[PDB]
Amino acid sequence: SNTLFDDIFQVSEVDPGRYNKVCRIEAASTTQDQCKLTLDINVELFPVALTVTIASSLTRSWRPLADDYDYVMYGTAYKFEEVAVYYSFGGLLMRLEGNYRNLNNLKQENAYLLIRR
Amino acid sequence: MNAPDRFELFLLGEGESKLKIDPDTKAPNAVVITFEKEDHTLGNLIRAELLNDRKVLFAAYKVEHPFFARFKLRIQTTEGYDPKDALKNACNSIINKLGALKTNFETEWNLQTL
Amino acid sequence: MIVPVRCFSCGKVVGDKWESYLNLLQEDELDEGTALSRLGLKRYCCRRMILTHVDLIEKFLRYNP
Amino acid sequence: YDRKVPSPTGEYVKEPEWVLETDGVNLSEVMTVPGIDPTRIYTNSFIDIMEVLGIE
Amino acid sequence: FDMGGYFIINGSEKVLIAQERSAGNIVQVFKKAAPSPISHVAEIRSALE
Amino acid sequence: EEGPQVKIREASKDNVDFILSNVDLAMANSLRRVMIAEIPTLAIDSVEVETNTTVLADEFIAHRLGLIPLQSMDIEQLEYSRDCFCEDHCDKCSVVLTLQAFGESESTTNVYSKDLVIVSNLMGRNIGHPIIQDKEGNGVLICKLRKGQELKLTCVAKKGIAKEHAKWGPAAAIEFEYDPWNKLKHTDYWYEQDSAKEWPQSKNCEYEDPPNEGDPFDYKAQADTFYMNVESVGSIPVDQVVVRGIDTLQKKVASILLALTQM
Amino acid sequence: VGVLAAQSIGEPATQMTLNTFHFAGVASKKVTSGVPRLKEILNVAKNMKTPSLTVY
Amino acid sequence: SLHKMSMMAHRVKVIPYSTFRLNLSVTSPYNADFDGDEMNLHVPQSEETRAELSQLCAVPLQIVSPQSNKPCMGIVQDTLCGIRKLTLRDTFIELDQVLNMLYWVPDWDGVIPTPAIIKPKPLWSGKQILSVAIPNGIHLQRFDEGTTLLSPKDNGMLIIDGQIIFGVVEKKTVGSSNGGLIHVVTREKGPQVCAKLFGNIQKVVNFWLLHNGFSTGIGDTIADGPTMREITETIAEAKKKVLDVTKEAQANLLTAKHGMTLRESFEDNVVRFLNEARDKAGRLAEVNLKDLNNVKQMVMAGSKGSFINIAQMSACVGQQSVEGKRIAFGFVDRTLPHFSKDDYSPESKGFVENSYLRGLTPQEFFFHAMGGREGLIDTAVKTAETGYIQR
Amino acid sequence: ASRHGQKGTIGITYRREDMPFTAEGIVPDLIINPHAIPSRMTVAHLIECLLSKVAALSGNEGDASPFTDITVEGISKLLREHGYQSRGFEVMYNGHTGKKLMAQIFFGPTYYQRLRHMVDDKIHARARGPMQVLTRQPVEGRSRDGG
Amino acid sequence: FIVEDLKVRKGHIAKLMATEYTWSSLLNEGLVEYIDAEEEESILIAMQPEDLEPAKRIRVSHHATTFTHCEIHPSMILGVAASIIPFPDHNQSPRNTYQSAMGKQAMGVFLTNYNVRMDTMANILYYPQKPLGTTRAMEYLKFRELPAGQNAIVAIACYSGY
Amino acid sequence: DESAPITAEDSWAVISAFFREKGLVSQQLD
Amino acid sequence: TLSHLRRTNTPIKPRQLHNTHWGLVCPAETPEGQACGLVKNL
Amino acid sequence: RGNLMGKRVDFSARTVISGDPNLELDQVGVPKSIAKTLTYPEVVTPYNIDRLTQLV
RNA sequence: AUCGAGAGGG
DNA sequence: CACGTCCCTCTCGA
Ligand SMILES: Nc1ncnc2c1ncn2[C@@H]1O[C@H](COP(=O)(O)OP(=O)(O)OP(=O)(O)O)[C@@H](O)[C@H]1O
Ligand SMILES: [Mg+2]
Ligand SMILES: [Mg+2]
Ligand SMILES: [Mg+2]
Ligand SMILES: [Zn+2]
Ligand SMILES: [Zn+2]
């Protein structure tokens, strides 16, 4: 039940688009400069100008301690794209392009998102 | 014509108990109290001073319909911790908060004079 | 039709200020908005409460019984 | 008019073609003219068409 | 503020509604239908004022 | 000082400004509501008309008499006409008023708020007095009579709150405001060029410090310090408007306990 | 199905010519070829108001 | 009663005040608004005519019409306007507001959805919270203009197992669309299931709009900022592009079209040089107006309003058409006694260069008043043609 | 109805505490739906509401006269002259919870008219009921307790 | 009006505003004329007076000069019921054609002698108010003296969904 | 000064004059 | 009241608002129904 | 055509309609007064006899 | 009451 | 040469 993905990305591109509280994003994986990543991020809680994870814990109802990051989101994946996964956070989307950690990440319909400094 | 007599906004009827506790069958350790003859004067107030209850899970209220002065209040709390008590601990918290406002307004008020 | 006791959207009493407002322009000869302003009507719902009202009772008491 | 017809590659494609409209209806005679498509001709006068081409 | 112009008949106030009419003693030229034999018509509504 | 603190800005016989430090908005609003509707007050409720020859119909003059303010300082010692035990009304739930008016003067004869006299016993408690804030000490203008008009009626006042009818509304307008600099993002301003320049800074803006542009909005900020101002039609002084607003809301949350232990 | 097609055809016609002033002077094909021609079509009538032969 | 739908069977719910009260979504079937509108009520007398009403003519039984094989009920007015306002990414709902929403759903599973955003401050997406009212088991798929699998402007729509994936909810999603949410829910779930959906959304969406609020003033019919400086130019050249043909045929040089005379031809080109320009100031209007515009917002959701409306109110009214053709010459060879004789310009023939914001002229108004009547006549005199064809 | 063909019935009635409120304490006598505007195209309504807004404030009968050069950009200059939102709007607060509204409300007076259509004087209902003289079916009209 | 090289002057403006404490003057003084619809056929009228001789709202070709008459004020094309419409130029024309018939449906004091006449049915408003928005045509409909409605604080906004 | 022409505001005094002679029921009475 | 006294009945398009109606009849005041543009106001 | 193809009927009603966002789709808020004038001939049976006598 | 006439509403 | 949508609400006159 550990991290399903660990990698870091770069100050790539920031987009509002009539949206003034959330921004789409691009990112180049610093491990292998070939792993694209694009997603929305509430720039209100977390501006941008650079870490990432996935994981799946730490079902059942929700209540108000494995937070070690800053901006955290919960969502579900909705597509698998060969060459890249697509995730959604209620309304916020995300696309991680790759081919390598096919085992770490999985086709689940559940996962959190963590960002560090 | 078909308009209800104004006073039915606060005066109870035959047998109506102001509060009526029903158990939320859906989620366990939860209750829904039907406050009769009340509105967002009390509704929004109690819900908010329940949210601050550390051991309280859910706290919401809907005025079933603007015609009928009444609202349902659903309350859920940590296991064992009776929600009926969570309402009492939330209520006194309001009155004790209110009472301090009165005395802090009365003294501040008793000073200035223009 | 006579001064409305208490403003509609406020509750502010304005039934007493008729013959005061009226005499703030007959006697003192002031600007209507400045008279309303001097009769203590900061919120415009009261301002309209006096300004728009026409005192038709005066044209009523002209008949006999 | 731009009429849609299937290209040799099978896909439907937009190939224009010329058409003439009238302010009169003599179907029984205008269809027998040489130099048109007597299968595509059309008059909005459905009454005249019932008379020329049968009820169906 | 009552400006009148109306009658009082057995109690009720009866008003006279302006009845419009194409004037008389005037000459007018009109076409006619496609199947009509007449090509055109000249009309005058002869009446004394 | 004890939690929900206060701070008076201004105060007079009609209006009363004050800031509420460290208080829940959902509560403060609920006090605004209580102030408006659910504070007890007296006013006319039944008008027996002996003779009315005025240009104003009966119930038209009726409609307002209740709308007229009545003294209500010591209202808590007058039971609700419905809660008392007497056939109809009496002295421990009603304050009988009489308004007799004949116009002798050829010059039109005004009937006022002062012109109503009480034909009941007050029992030495402030009640039923037609609140007169007038410049010339005349009160609210109810009617106008000619050379021989007349008006004989009798008003039976009763305890009541604005909920039954807003003529028992002890409060006028309740100035409500908080977070003058939209730091909490509780409203998405509307503009065709500039949001700030098109919307004027409120009066209660000098009291909170400006936002400081080069900053990151802190979600953790919450509603605090509410800029209020309560007006009194008269029925109850502007202290009790807020004191009994605070105090009759108390009884609301407390009667919820009353029936809470009956379960 | 018949009393239904009737309404299904008649409702939009009667209802389209009820929302003609929501745009004031627009006309369009409300009372140009819709209500008119349709009346022709139902009554049949040989004296068609615009006999056209769209000849391919 | 021009409709199978204009007579429906409802459950009685006795209530005070002397009005019949009906759910706002069942307006479109009867074509009812709440402006002095009046409705009949009939009551069965036997248990069989009863069942006959509840087993055939029930309102939810009638949710999808044979008329146009589509839903004839759907979200409208308040609920629609606030449901795209709600279903956004900028639109977030905090906890004190979220528990209220969750409760209003009577068929609620009583389980708090894990918040789309957790830790900085537990927040929920507009669509995310909306999804508990959409019943698990629903799958819908829509692609708009450029809608991708990673929606750009929250484009299109995709609901998977009754939760929203991406995209803003608008008329297409939640209206009476051929393949809209209503349609899909009534087929793959049931008539009465969808009905409860109608309420489950009107109870939530409306609640959110209550505390978000929404208005509309003259501010929303204002472009003025170099888009009114842009539009005015479009109407200037249009008076020259129509003046072009105006002088062309004044010296015979009018290459008359084949079939339509020089006059007919001229007007046909002239008439669309205004309608194609006035319609171009209506998209110039739509452009300047931000996504914070209110008139613009109601039309984007499909609440109320159309492309023309924004044009006429903010940009330009346009030519007035009586009996199809433009404003004619009631006076001898002239259109008004304020106009030169034989004047063919667009100003004389009934073109309203001004918008409703700017305010028409003494002339612009009258013509616009002529054209309206022509309409007011259709809506009151030419209805007897269509009521008879139906009979 | 306002004086621009703005008909409409009362869907519900509210007290001031249930009602939305400006910050000055002002409350709306009337809440008309924003959707009655684009389709009805009554911009004169919006302008009468903005004009009457100033008319009350400065206290001067506002010239709604038709064909004069009175702009909205000037009225707004007068409405910001009195310190209000130049376009009629005002940050208003949710009556129930007391928090603001994530949108501002075009406010201000508007001349409305009570029209001779009272629901109480229109409502009718019947069972059994009187019966026509010759056709032995229900009689026409509310006046006659008919069907 | 009639024009040459405007017949009526600010002098005649005082020949009237004083007399308020004549019109047939302007008729016999040859400054005005009763033109029926046929006599219109052979005349040319100037819309606004000063605006039709030699930012805001857009205008047209006033430069074409040959005028014989002038329009008193453009407003005067309206009937009584439609005259009380504020800003009818900023309104879809049918809206105007409605409020025209609804102003006749409204309430308010219709005559000052209602107390003394026995008319079958009749409504009177409790507190009529002269409107905040007034046309200059109103002073002549005696409308500020016998209003038909009330200036209500109107909040255009969504709230409950009622 | 009996000289200048007329303004848009001046026309209103003219209209005011028209009614003080003919009135609103002008044609009905005449 | 006034509107009723300046009313124009026209017997059984004669409905369309005409140009010669400028200045003599109201372009807006007329009833929606079997009278729209037929019965006008002055 | 208006005595047999269409009749006036008992057990009928009519009033002004207002919209309700807190009602259910398949419902109709009927004013109390209408529900006191509108009836339904229920038949007495063990299933309803206890409810029925209370109403009476 | 019944026939006729008219004015409104959706 | 016969049709000319649907209901609903009031007023008055042999
Ligand atoms: N003459 C008529 N015949 C039949 N039905 C009519 C007639 N007039 C109106 N209706 C019906 O009543 C409604 C008329 O629309 P309504 O008068 O309610 O105006 P609206 O569309 O709300 O106008 P606005 O654009 O001013 O909002 C429609 O539902 C229509 O079917
Ligand atoms: Mg309607
Ligand atoms: Mg409507
Ligand atoms: Mg209509
Ligand atoms: Zn006020
Ligand atoms: Zn007693």
The secondary structure of H235-283 as a DSSP string is HHHHHHHHHHHHHHGGGT---PPSSS-HHHHHHHHHHHHHHHHHHHHHH
Q: Which amino acid appears at position C34 of this protein?
A: T
Pairing of strands H11-15, M27-31: parallel
Residue with tokens 């010329």: D18
Please say whether the beta carbons of K8 and J48 come within 8 A. yes
Q: Which amino acid appears at position J88 of this protein?
A: P
| SS3 assignment, position A6 | strand
Please say whether the beta carbons of F48 and F98 come within 8 A. no
Helix axes J93-102, H362-378, angle to 10 degrees: 70
List the beta bridge partners of residue B39.
none
Q: Which amino acid appears at position D32 of this protein?
A: T
Best residue of C14, C43, C59, C61 to probe chain F, by most F CBs closer than 10 Å: C61
How long is the CA J80 to C1' O13 vector, in angstroms? 30
Closest CA to J38 of H337, H344, H350, H365: H337
- Sheet of L40-41: strands edge to edge? E18-19, L7-9, L40-41
The 10 Å CB-count burial string (b at 16+, else e) for D4-26 is eeeeeeeeeeeeeeeeeeeeebe
Closest CA to B111 of C34, I49, H307, F18: F18
Pairwise CA distance, residues J54 & J64, whole Å: 9
Of chain L residues 2-41, which have a beta carbon within 7 Å of strand N? 9, 31-33, 35, 39
| SS3 assignment, position F158 | strand
Could you tell me the CA-to-CA distances from H80 to A92, A98, H199, J67, M34 in Å, in that order? Answer: 21, 40, 13, 55, 32
DSSP I79-123: HHHTTS-TTS----B-TTT--B-SS-----EEEE--BS--GGGT-
When computed from its CA atoms, the radius of gyration of chain E, rounded to whole angstroms, is 20
List the beta bridge partners of residue G55.
D20
CATH number at residue C9: 1.10.10.60
| Helices (runs of H) and strands (runs of E) counted in chain E | 0, 5
| SS3 assignment, position M19 | strand
Residue C11: which residues within 8 A CB-CB, separation 6 or more?
F166, F169, F171, F172, F173, F233, I16
State which H helix or E strand residue I129 sits in.
Answer: none
Q: Please give the DSSP secondary-structure letter assigned to residue K26.
A: H
Pairwise CA distance, residues H252 & A53, whole Å: 78
Q: Do H103 and B3 touch (CB under 8 A)?
A: no
Pairwise CA distance, residues C38 & A37, whole Å: 66
Q: Do J78 and L1 touch (CB under 8 A)?
A: no
Task: Dig out the tokens for E46 from the structure.
Answer: 């002869």
State which H helix or E strand residue E14 sits in.
Answer: strand E12-14
Task: Dig out the tokens for J91 from the structure.
Answer: 């309104």
Pairwise CA distance, residues F144 & F130, whole Å: 18
Q: Which amino acid appears at position A112 of this protein?
A: Y
Nearest-5° angle of CA A72, CA A74, CA A75? 140
Pairwise CA distance, residues H179 & H213, whole Å: 30
Task: Dig out the tokens for I8 from the structure.
Answer: 């409409």
- Does domain H63-215 fall under CATH 3.80.10.10? My reply is no
Contacts of E2 in chain J (CB under 8 A): 111, 113
DSSP J54-110: ---------------EE-S-GGGGS-HHHHT-S-GGGS-HHHHHHHHHHTTTB-S-S
| Contact residues, L window 1-40, toward E, CB-based 8 Å cutoff | 1-2, 4-11, 39
Ligand 1, closest atom to CA I39? 25
Pairwise CA distance, residues C9 & J153, whole Å: 8
When computed from its CA atoms, the radius of gyration of chain C, rounded to whole angstroms, is 13
Burial classification of residue A101, based on how many CB atoms lie within 10 Å of its CB (0-12 exposed, 13-18 middle, 19 or more buried):
middle
DSSP F90-117: -TTTEEEEEEEEE--SSS-EEE-STT-E
Q: From the Cβ of H374, is strand N under 7 Å away?
A: no
Cβ of residue H31 lying under 6 Å from some atom of ligand 1:
yes
Q: Please give the DSSP secondary-structure letter assigned to residue H27.
A: H
Q: Which nucleotides of O are covered by protein (CB under 7 A)?
A: 3-13
Pairing of strands E18-19, L7-9: parallel
Residues, chain L: 42
Pairwise CA distance, residues H67 & G6, whole Å: 10
Pairwise CA distance, residues H379 & L32, whole Å: 8
| SS3 assignment, position I56 | helix
F11 touches chain I (CB under 8 A): no
Please say whether the beta carbons of K3 and J10 come within 8 A. yes
Residue C41: which residues within 8 A CB-CB, separation 6 or more?
C12, C14, C47, C49, C50
Please say whether the beta carbons of H340 and J45 come within 8 A. no
Q: Which residue is nearest to nucleotide O10 (CA to C1')?
A: I143
Task: Dig out the tokens for I139 from the structure.
Answer: 């009689």
Pairwise CA distance, residues I108 & I105, whole Å: 9
Q: Which nucleotides of N are covered by protein (CB under 7 A)?
A: 1-2, 7-10
* Cβ neighbours, 10 Å, residue H369: 27
List the beta bridge partners of residue I126.
M12
List the beta bridge partners of residue H11.
M27
Contacts of F166 in chain I (CB under 8 A): 15-16
Q: What share of chain M is helix, strand, coil (3-state, %, to 5)?
A: 25, 25, 50
Burial classification of residue J26, based on how many CB atoms lie within 10 Å of its CB (0-12 exposed, 13-18 middle, 19 or more buried):
buried
* Phi, psi torsion values for J29, nearest 5 degrees: -70, 5
CA atoms within 13 A on the CB side of I38: 24
Chain mean position to CA E30: 18
* Cβ neighbours, 10 Å, residue B8: 15
* Cβ neighbours, 10 Å, residue A67: 12
* Cβ neighbours, 10 Å, residue A49: 5
Burial classification of residue F247, based on how many CB atoms lie within 10 Å of its CB (0-12 exposed, 13-18 middle, 19 or more buried):
middle
Pairwise CA distance, residues G55 & D43, whole Å: 8
Pairing of strands A13-15, A23-28: antiparallel
Please say whether the beta carbons of M18 and H19 come within 8 A. yes
Pairwise CA distance, residues H372 & H368, whole Å: 6
Nearest-5° angle of CA J118, CA J120, CA J122? 90
Residue J132: which residues within 8 A CB-CB, separation 6 or more?
C48, C51, C52, I48, I51, I52, I55, I56, I61, I62, I109, I111, J151
State which H helix or E strand residue I134 sits in.
Answer: none
Task: Dig out the tokens for J23 from the structure.
Answer: 């019109």
Residue with tokens 């995730």: A87
Ligand 1, closest atom to CA H36? 18
Q: Which amino acid appears at position H264 of this protein?
A: E
Task: Dig out the tokens for I65 from the structure.
Answer: 């006269």
* Phi, psi torsion values for J74, nearest 5 degrees: -55, -25
List the beta bridge partners of residue H92.
H125
Residue with tokens 């519900």: I12
Any chains having at least 3 CB pairs less than 8 A from chain F are A, B, C, H, I, J
Q: What is the resolution of this structure in A?
A: 3.3
Contacts of L42 in chain E (CB under 8 A): 18
Task: Dig out the tokens for H66 from the structure.
Answer: 């044979």
Please say whether the beta carbons of J51 and J59 come within 8 A. yes
Closest CA to F38 of F185, F166, F192: F166
Please say whether the beta carbons of H180 and H173 come within 8 A. yes
Residues, chain F: 263
Any chains having at least 3 CB pairs less than 8 A from chain G are D, H, J
Pairwise CA distance, residues H124 & H95, whole Å: 8
Please say whether the beta carbons of F27 and I99 come within 8 A. no
Residue I22: which residues within 8 A CB-CB, separation 6 or more?
I90, I91, I92, I93, I107
Report the chain J residue with the minimal C-alpha distance to residue K10: J13
Beta strands per DSSP E along M1-56: 12-20, 27-31
Burial classification of residue F122, based on how many CB atoms lie within 10 Å of its CB (0-12 exposed, 13-18 middle, 19 or more buried):
middle
> Long-range contacts for H108-114 (Cβ within 8 Å, ≥24 apart)?
H108/B26, H108/H132, H109/B26, H110/A61, H110/B24, H110/B26, H110/B27, H110/B30, H111/A61, H111/A62, H111/B27, H112/A61, H112/A62, H112/A63, H112/B58, H113/A62, H114/A62, H114/A74
| Domains, chain F, with CATH or none | 2-40+167-263 (3.30.1360.10), 41-166 (2.170.120.12)
Pairwise CA distance, residues I81 & I54, whole Å: 9
* Cβ neighbours, 10 Å, residue A83: 7
Task: Dig out the tokens for H75 from the structure.
Answer: 């979200």
State which H helix or E strand residue I65 sits in.
Answer: none
The CATH classification number of A1-117 equals 2.40.50.140
CATH number at residue B110: 3.30.1360.10
Pairwise CA distance, residues H367 & I38, whole Å: 21
State which H helix or E strand residue G39 sits in.
Answer: helix G35-43
Sign of CA dihedral B47, B48, B54, B59: positive
Tell me which of 1.10.150.120, 3.30.230.10, 2.40.40.20, 3.40.190.10 is the CATH number of domain H1-62. Answer: 2.40.40.20
Tell how far the Cα of G18 is from the centroid of ligand 1, in angstroms.
Answer: 7
Pairwise CA distance, residues H195 & H60, whole Å: 6
Closest CA to F134 of H203, C20, H73, H229: C20
Q: From the Cβ of H36, is strand O under 7 Å away?
A: no
Sign of CA dihedral H158, H162, H165, H171: positive
Q: From the Cβ of H384, is strand O under 7 Å away?
A: yes
Nearest CA, atom 30, ligand 1: G18
Residue I92: which residues within 8 A CB-CB, separation 6 or more?
H213, I20, I21, I22, I23, I100, I101, I104, I105, I107, J155, J157
Number of domains in chain B: 1
Residue H180: which residues within 8 A CB-CB, separation 6 or more?
H71, H74, H172, H173, H174
How long is the CA I133 to C1' N1 vector, in angstroms? 10
Closest CA to F155 of F31, F56, F26, F65: F65
Q: Mark the binding-site residues of H, compressed into ranges.
A: 33, 35, 37
Closest CA to H67 of G35, G14, G5: G5
Burial classification of residue B4, based on how many CB atoms lie within 10 Å of its CB (0-12 exposed, 13-18 middle, 19 or more buried):
middle
Pairwise CA distance, residues H322 & H319, whole Å: 10
| Contact residues, C window 5-64, toward J, CB-based 8 Å cutoff | 8-9, 45, 48, 51-54, 56, 59-60, 62-63
Q: Which residues surround ligand 6, an ion (CB under 5 A)?
A: F 84, 86, 90, 92-93
CA atoms within 13 A on the CB side of H362: 27
Please say whether the beta carbons of F157 and F99 come within 8 A. no
Domain map of chain A by residue range? 1-117
After what residues is chain M interrupted, C–N > 2.5 A? none
Could you tell me the CA-to-CA distances from I121 to A80, I124, M50 in Å, in that order? Answer: 65, 9, 37
Task: Dig out the tokens for J96 from the structure.
Answer: 């105007």
Chain mean position to CA H10: 27
Pairwise CA distance, residues H332 & J67, whole Å: 17
The 10 Å CB-count burial string (b at 16+, else e) for I37-71 is bbbbbbbbbbbbbbbbbbbbbbbebbbbbbbbebe
DSSP A13-32: EEE-SS-SS-EEEEEE-SSS
Contacts of H217 in chain J (CB under 8 A): 156
The CATH fold assigned to H216-361 is Topoisomerase I; Chain A, domain 4 (1.10.132)
State which H helix or E strand residue F244 sits in.
Answer: helix F238-258
| SS3 assignment, position F198 | helix
Pairwise CA distance, residues E47 & J100, whole Å: 37
Best residue of H19, H23, H98, H100 to probe chain B, by most B CBs closer than 10 Å: H100
When computed from its CA atoms, the radius of gyration of chain J, rounded to whole angstroms, is 21
When computed from its CA atoms, the radius of gyration of chain G, rounded to whole angstroms, is 14
Residue with tokens 């505001």: K9
List the beta bridge partners of residue A94.
A39, A87
Please say whether the beta carbons of H166 and H153 come within 8 A. no
Closest CA to I93 of I80, I104, I84, I79: I104
Residue range of the domain that includes C13: 1-65
In angstroms, how far is the first alpha carbon of chain E from the final one?
35
| SS3 assignment, position H346 | coil
Pairwise CA distance, residues I4 & I111, whole Å: 10
State which H helix or E strand residue F33 sits in.
Answer: helix F25-37
H285 touches chain F (CB under 8 A): no
| SS3 assignment, position J25 | helix
DSSP C10-34: T----SSSHHHHTHHHHTS---HHH
Please say whether the beta carbons of J137 and L36 come within 8 A. no
Tell how far the Cα of H32 is from the centroid of ligand 2, in angstroms.
Answer: 6
Task: Dig out the tokens for D31 from the structure.
Answer: 């269809």
Q: Mark the binding-site residues of H for Mg(2+), compressed into ranges.
A: 33, 35, 37
Please say whether the beta carbons of F117 and F98 come within 8 A. yes
Burial classification of residue B110, based on how many CB atoms lie within 10 Å of its CB (0-12 exposed, 13-18 middle, 19 or more buried):
exposed
Could you tell me the CA-to-CA distances from H157 to A22, H165, H272, H303, I143 in Å, in that order? Answer: 19, 8, 37, 18, 54
- Sheet of F41-52: strands edge to edge? F41-52, F150-160, F94-102, F117-118
Please say whether the beta carbons of F122 and F128 come within 8 A. yes
Residue range of the domain that includes B52: 1-114
Pairwise CA distance, residues F168 & H41, whole Å: 40
Report the chain H residue with the minimal C-alpha distance to residue F26: H96
